[PDB]
Amino acid sequence: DEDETTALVCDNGSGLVKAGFAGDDAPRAVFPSIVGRPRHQGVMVGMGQKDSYVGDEAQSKRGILTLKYPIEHGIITNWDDMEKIWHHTFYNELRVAPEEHPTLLTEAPLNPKANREKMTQIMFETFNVPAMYVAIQAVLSLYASGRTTGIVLDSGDGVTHNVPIYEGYALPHAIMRLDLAGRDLTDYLMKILTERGYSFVTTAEREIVRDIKEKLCYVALDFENEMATAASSSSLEKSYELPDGQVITIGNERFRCPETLFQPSFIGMESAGIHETTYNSIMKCDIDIRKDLYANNVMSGGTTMYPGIADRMQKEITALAPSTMKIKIIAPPERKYSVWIGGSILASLSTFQQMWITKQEYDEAGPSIVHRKCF
Amino acid sequence: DEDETTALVCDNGSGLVKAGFAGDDAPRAVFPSIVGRPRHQGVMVGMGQKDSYVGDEAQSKRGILTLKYPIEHGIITNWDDMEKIWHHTFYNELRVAPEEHPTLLTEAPLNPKANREKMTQIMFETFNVPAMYVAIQAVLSLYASGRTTGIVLDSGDGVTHNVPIYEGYALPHAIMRLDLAGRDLTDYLMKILTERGYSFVTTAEREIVRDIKEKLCYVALDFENEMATAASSSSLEKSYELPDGQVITIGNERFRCPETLFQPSFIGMESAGIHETTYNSIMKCDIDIRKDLYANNVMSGGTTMYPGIADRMQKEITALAPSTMKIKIIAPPERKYSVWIGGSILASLSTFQQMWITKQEYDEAGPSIVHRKCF
Amino acid sequence: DEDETTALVCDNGSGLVKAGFAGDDAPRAVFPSIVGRPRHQGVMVGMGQKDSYVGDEAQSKRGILTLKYPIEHGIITNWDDMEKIWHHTFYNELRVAPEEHPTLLTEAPLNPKANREKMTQIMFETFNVPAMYVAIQAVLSLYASGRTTGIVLDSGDGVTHNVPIYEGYALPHAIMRLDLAGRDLTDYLMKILTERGYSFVTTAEREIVRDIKEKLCYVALDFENEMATAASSSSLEKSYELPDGQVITIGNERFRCPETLFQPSFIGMESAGIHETTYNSIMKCDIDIRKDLYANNVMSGGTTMYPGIADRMQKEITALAPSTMKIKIIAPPERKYSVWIGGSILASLSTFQQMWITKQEYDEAGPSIVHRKCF
Amino acid sequence: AXXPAWX
Ligand SMILES: Nc1ncnc2c1ncn2[C@@H]1O[C@H](COP(=O)(O)OP(=O)(O)O)[C@@H](O)[C@H]1O
């Protein structure tokens, strides 16, 4: 097993569990944050066929399951299913006892504090961790950059952040939160695939559409001329073989899916877009911070592996920011993992080991200790 | 280090520390007399991030600090912060031990005597200087001129002086003090910049406005025709690029800022102006002194590097003084430093080395020794 | 209609239009200063459905509109939308022709002068008013008090003032301006409601949060013991039924919202607070003014109908002011309207009818006439 | 008295 007391870094954003140990390059366990459950009856007698499938096994059996994400927009909705996800995380995937390891959880800013509080209650009461710490996810995404100055966009499966930090000091009044992320892009892609002719409605078919979004989507630097480019010829069409047979061929849907991220009116969501929430987070900072946020604009979570989103990102922030400013969009190709990687850095720091919310301090101050020790 | 017992000449007027050694051309250390302090929380763990930034480092980090001047109108208000300023002065900037060097401090006339007395108590009790001497700042500004006859205007960041001296003898009944100086001009410029459209309210933005005042202001020899000159055309407008982006364009504010110095009604301060306090200091002197004060009207501190203030100064004192008098405004371009330079002259004089308030005379007579040895 | 030439008193602070006639108790028209605009497509053919909704109609349709305030921190940002607001003000709500009536506009001190100048240009060029006059809003708030001596705090939706006046003479060097007001409190309440669990992000949901702030907030005389009082029991919790269904229950957010007004660090704004800007405005006045400002401390605009803000206000100014001073916070329950009411007094004065900026004097001196006739 | 800074 693990012969030491190495800290656990568990990172469930809203749609993908990535967990592992501190002082480590990559997360050891990366699996979908789903719990599946059979929706019709078992007939082969003597089969096993447990009435819950968590993680990657659920996508192995998703044709006979109703898949259900226990965490939506960064908020944990099903608590017993999230306990299934954590139980599978420690005991099956990462294959370790939580009693021996301090654990580092992550969440978004501007979240309900009962998420953080009940997450601490489940970590100490159910899994009996010795220490525990919730961490703001974009902050850790700046720990992976090796920077102490920068504004961080990450955009996981349920939430996007823009946390600005200058010289180690965060600017929590200048913080942002938009609930437009990759599951919303998956749903919008599923809608416009219904526009082309392909009907995906099941949760398993939603997982197929999510795969189409990951394999086969880019961001379109200039959306109008890319739109007319797809309207002119079929040079942007691309085929995807569905599981078990039929192939599909998608055109302008390839780049209309993450244009919703730059233009949230497509999914009917009144917002300013990703590029304007970055600029508005920078303009909420003080005057002497802003060029150090322009040159350090870290873009480091999931849903940013769309090809060209750093080009669209710089190309649009440059249009908002004044001239003679140096707009550098940092898009480090190890992102989708850098919230975990910065979790690994922070949990492996030696200054940090008196910042763990420990037991006998949880037992002393109840579950509200998180609002005086964590942030 | 320093292989001798050279005297320290430390000169904090109210807004800029300029310190160094005696027998020296220029002050070795010139830095802002500010102490900064973080106003929101530290988030990057393992950073250092001390909870006090003194001097130039505070302007390096002023976007996340609340800057605070420990000395206001020549009066030290925060004593622990002034001890931070002195501690940084000797041990970080000038990088020397105060135990080895007699120190020469400066202050204004007509100051509270607890400023001078507590400054002596902090120099002997805290820094353990062997000798110490407070000095009237405009007197030293006449030591830099190489003159022993003249009336001295200096106008630092918090106070302006007009000390008249004839044949080595000061006229302390004819002395003056106005509390209108460059920080008041910075605040008034910040107000009329709010009149044009640019809102500066933070202490860091106050430091930006102070920079606009230094780079981009002159004094307007004839204020009414300069005022109508700016009202006629845009030939007096000038642009200033703010830190991190946006450029501004100032017009009549370029010369309405130091017209407050010649006309204190703009900042709502009942006074006679700079040009009339000089003439009133001369008329308080005796009849046989005045033409030697007219021809030796030294104008030698900070806030006098406005272009044309010697032209406005001579042009207005000539209108007050009788005809067939020779009005010579001495404006030696080494001013903003000549209070320090005359401190260097006075501390390097050989007649002066029995005028130091020494320890074992401080210990004998308490801290009130300054009111029998200094002046 | 109106059979006379009664002057119009239009008062848009930044968030609420209150307009009417001079010589009148209450404003005739009070409606939100919003202009709404449909953000998705019209489908019922033959509907009307104009592509702009101004005023109260916009809050009748805010579920399908993006509401937008044309005036932010007392500065008019959208000029065509403010012309929609004025056009709706005269022709729909107040239902009168501007050609027949002199109009009295209000703004804050320390505003951009292009706001005042373009407001005069829009009043004469577009609406063809015979006369026009901009007025400092807290001054008019002292006209409603029946006093000619006092310091005035008002705190509308975008700006707070502290204009001190003694014996009819204002002290414009002792004037103040803080850009912390009720829309900032609405945004901060919306943030800490996201902390409890309720997500409000749309402009219509911002209007719901503003309603929660108006119905269900007080100021907490002692913030620490009120904070621990809410932490002890649920006797401070109070429920609010949202539009269309779900009820919410707010606790310490009920008094943490206007504590930002007394402590601007909550919204990350470096300032001294309301209680210290009053005391600093009094200390900038002369020595023989101050007890007549202490006994006449008028507190008379919007965002002052928090219960107990006069108790917190007196309780904190008494701690700043010296003892044996009589601190009287005047909080006349007709405030939120007293800027309009004092506008009605001033426009109905007989001495005032040669102080109107009239046309043929606008046409003679351009739009800069406001900076010689108004103030 | 006075001032700020002065008494
Ligand atoms: N290569 C890719 N291109 C585009 N989107 C991706 C890619 N890989 C993952 N995603 C999207 O990113 C989201 C997961 O991002 P991540 O931050 O790892 O999730 P979590 O928020 O659970 O940590 C999923 O919605 C997925 O659809």
Ligand SMILES: Nc1ncnc2c1ncn2[C@@H]1O[C@H](COP(=O)(O)OP(=O)(O)O)[C@@H](O)[C@H]1O
């Ligand atoms: N070139 C310049 N033009 C106008 N004002 C200046 C210039 N340089 C410095 N000042 C002003 O002079 C003041 C500092 O003068 P100085 O006498 O050095 O201050 P101190 O009183 O700290 O000695 C500051 O307020 C600064 O704004």
Ligand SMILES: Nc1ncnc2c1ncn2[C@@H]1O[C@H](COP(=O)(O)OP(=O)(O)O)[C@@H](O)[C@H]1O
């Ligand atoms: N009863 C109340 N309690 C607290 N705040 C209020 C109340 N009524 C109005 N407000 C706030 O006052 C602001 C409007 O005040 P007012 O002076 O009318 O604004 P304006 O600047 O538009 O004149 C709005 O932000 C509103 O939220």
Ligand SMILES: [Mg+2]
């Ligand atoms: Mg993530």
Ligand SMILES: [Mg+2]
């Ligand atoms: Mg000086």
Ligand SMILES: [Mg+2]
């Ligand atoms: Mg108002």
